[PDB]
């Protein structure tokens, strides 16, 4: 919420109706000002929503609060939703509501692992790159093994982030010296998701 207040999160099942409220005060929504709504999909600019002849999206307003209703909820409606109103000529935004569509199928991750380039080894450095994509829901555990033993040091893993397609992507980088890389028969990137592991291995 910001000067206008919105639930931080709302969820609904496909086909269901969900509602997102936007509460302001006597100075803005309660003052005969219009309420506009924007949809913001991952990594894009907000889009203004248009309610004319819109079959699934509609708005209500009473006093100091307004509401966006979505019927026949679909997975491509997952997005952040912001309401906006006016206090004189000032434009005022709500704080945002993340809409989640429930009951979406589990997707196991695709894992791609790259060895250090020879070029980087000339620089006296070595990065192994484990790329993890298209998984759902968004939590994964990434662990690294040098032959069979666990590697803790030198690991940098991103927090998963949602793609346009509604699945998540993540990356883990392991930094080694060229001698540490040459001294093992294999390195594995081990990715566990919802209890199943996908492992990928590379060798000098």
């Amino acid at each position: 919420a910001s000067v206008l207040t919105q639930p931080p999160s709302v969820s609904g099942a496909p086909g269901q109706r969900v509602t997102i409220s936007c509460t302001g005060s006597s100075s803005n929504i309660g003052a005969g000002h219009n309420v506009k709504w924007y949809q913001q999909l991952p990594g894009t600019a907000p889009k203004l929503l248009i309610f004319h002849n819109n079959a699934r999206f509609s708005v209500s307003k009473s006093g100091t609060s307004a509401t966006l209703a979505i019927t026949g909820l679909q997975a491509e409606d997952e997005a952040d939703y912001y309401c906006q109103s006016y206090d004189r000529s000032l434009r005022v935004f709500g704080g945002g509501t993340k809409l989640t569509v429930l009951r979406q199928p589990k997707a196991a991750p695709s894992v791609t692992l790259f060895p250090p380039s020879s070029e980087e080894l000339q620089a006296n450095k070595a990065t192994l790159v484990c790329l993890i994509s298209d998984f759902y829901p968004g939590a994964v555990t990434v662990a690294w093994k040098a032959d069979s033993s666990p590697v803790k040091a030198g690991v940098e893993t991103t927090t998963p982030s949602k793609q346009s397609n509604n699945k998540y992507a993540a990356s883990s980088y392991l930094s080694l010296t060229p001698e540490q890389w040459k001294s093992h028969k294999s390195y594995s990137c081990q990715v566990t998701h919802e209890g199943s592991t996908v492992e990928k291995t590379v060798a000098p």
Partner: protein, 209 residues
């Protein structure tokens, strides 16, 4: 169509003035409140202000004293100058078209401005040799963002640029990978074009098997 495009520094030192320009095309300049909105990383949208071509202007009261908006009718441009920035002003800045009555209907792409004492550093680019997946490792740059295209934009099919990781060094790395037919690994060339506008560095790296 109506097209709005931001331009400005990607890195600004604390206490300096952030300056950004938006160039407008495909629309009349005189019937709209030319707007700036920003979105701090992981936070909501925050209106900054608007300017009308006559000079009518209004700004968010919490930024009172730091905002100057400029219009240049001959260029169809308008600018934001935000003085005395602090880390708090790190955000994506959008210029937008406010219909006065009707809402903000056209938004630019946004420009990320990072406010930091750290210096820019352009990336080192390494090839990630191989359908086969091949890619480029764009290592140790600051700040975000970096743009990666393949074959000067000719290859779009099956390109996936991953979110950067912020490493303990304080520098970012990311990887871009493209999935290709195995038949092509000899007959077709794969070049990743990396552009890091904050340090004015462009690198082209051919990836071979």
């Amino acid at each position: 169509a109506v097209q709005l495009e931001q331009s400005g520094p990607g890195l600004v030192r604390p206490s300096q003035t952030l300056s950004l320009t938006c160039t407008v095309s495909g629309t009349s300049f005189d019937d709209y409140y030319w707007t700036w909105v920003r979105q701090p990383p992981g936070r909501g949208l925050e209106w900054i202000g608007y300017v009308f071509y006559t000079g009518t202007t209004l700004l968010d009261p919490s930024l009172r004293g730091r905002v100057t908006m400029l219009v240049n009718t001959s260029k169809n441009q308008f600018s934001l100058r935000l003085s005395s920035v602090t880390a708090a002003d790190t955000a994506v800045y959008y210029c937008a078209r406010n219909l006065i009555a009707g809402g903000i209907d056209v938004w630019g792409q946004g420009s990320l401005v990072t406010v930091s004492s750290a210096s820019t550093k352009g990336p080192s680019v390494f090839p990630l040799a191989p359908t086969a997946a091949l890619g480029c490792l764009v290592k140790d740059y600051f700040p975000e963002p970096v743009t990666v295209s393949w074959n000067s934009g000719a290859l779009t099919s099956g390109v996936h640029t991953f979110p950067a990781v912020l490493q303990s060094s304080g520098l970012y790395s990311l990887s871009s990978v493209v999935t290709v037919p195995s038949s092509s690994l000899g007959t077709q060339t794969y070049i990743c074009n990396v552009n890091h506008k904050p340090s004015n560095t462009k690198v082209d790296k051919k990836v071979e098997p």
